[model samples]
Target: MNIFEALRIDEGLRLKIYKDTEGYYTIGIGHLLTKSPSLNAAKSELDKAIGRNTNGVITKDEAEKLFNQDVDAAVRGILRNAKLKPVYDSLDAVRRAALINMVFQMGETGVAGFTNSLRMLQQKRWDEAAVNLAKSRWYNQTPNRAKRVITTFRTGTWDAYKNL
Candidate 1:
């Protein structure tokens, strides 16, 4: 099923997702409080992203809705699991969103190293996940984004998007 159709982003809902001052919402239509992609712009880029990444497996049209809908739910599910929830739950909304953004970009397996962050989310571990987050090629390749996500995960304050 087309997830976006299920989501049904009317102007009102788009505004709600975009204008929301608080609470987690999808990143479509540049929200007053969230990222800068205008609704159509976000949808456009997301459509292309899903299109390219889907490898023609899913049509771009289908990918667009799935990207906006199920992907968000997938991340939520990752957070829903007890062991995974704490990394996000430990943070404020902004920080949580930033980390969620990172997870959405990199996938859970990609960011799983923040041991302390992971432990804090569900169980306690001896080392912080940041150490591991910093150790990857992601750190070497996208130092800015990696650092921002790690910093937000650690401090729970995302001043701005570093575009990592």
Candidate 2:
């Protein structure tokens, strides 16, 4: 079978939100609920439409749409936080994309806590920023992702993942 079918088989289809076997709130082929307003809003709307307070339900397509919306909101929230605008604006498109990815994973507030990294970014000290980024607990948690982000900052190119 194809990868998509295999993934679907592994994840299993569930139209309704329910606690997973691991006890996390989940729905729609295993989309886990997190601190996401978009997911919450979509769930609320679905609940209203279905006429009950089920944790409600969603089609796979609807769940995917909500996931995309949540990601978009996260990127927008990072861009609009303003405190880092100048630093963000100073980077090339590749670096900017990397920063957005970091913010997406960490949230704007979480990224904001990287005071040394931000200071280095603001001063255009790319090397120092990379070093600071590498020093974070996030780097320890996901070294490959952290390396790519730091490499983008260090080189100002999208080359990190290009060969892969």
Instruction: Tell me the whole-model lDDT of each prediction, alpha carbons only.
Output: 0.48, 0.66
Question: Residue pairs in steric clash, candidate 1?
Answer: 29-39, 86-121, 87-121, 114-129, 115-129, 116-129, 119-123
Which candidate number maximizes TM-score? 2
Residues 1-164 of candidate 1 have per-residue lDDT tens digits of 12222223211134223333323224332222225545554444444644553222344345355556645764776576554576666655655565556565555765565554565434322136566557777678757656656665555454423331
What's the TM-score of each model vs. the native? 0.46, 0.63
Q: Write the per-residue lDDT of candidate 2 for residues 1-164, one digit (tens) a residue.
A: 22222224334567877665445556664455643446566577556544567567676676666555545665677678876676777777766766766665566888878888988887889898888889888899768767877887788776665654
Model 2 stretches astray by more than 4 angstroms = 1-32, 35-64
Query: Model 1, 10: alpha-carbon shift in Å?
Result: 25
lDDT for model 2 comes to 0.66
Off by over 4 Å in 1: 1-64, 120-132, 162-164
Highest lDDT model number: 2
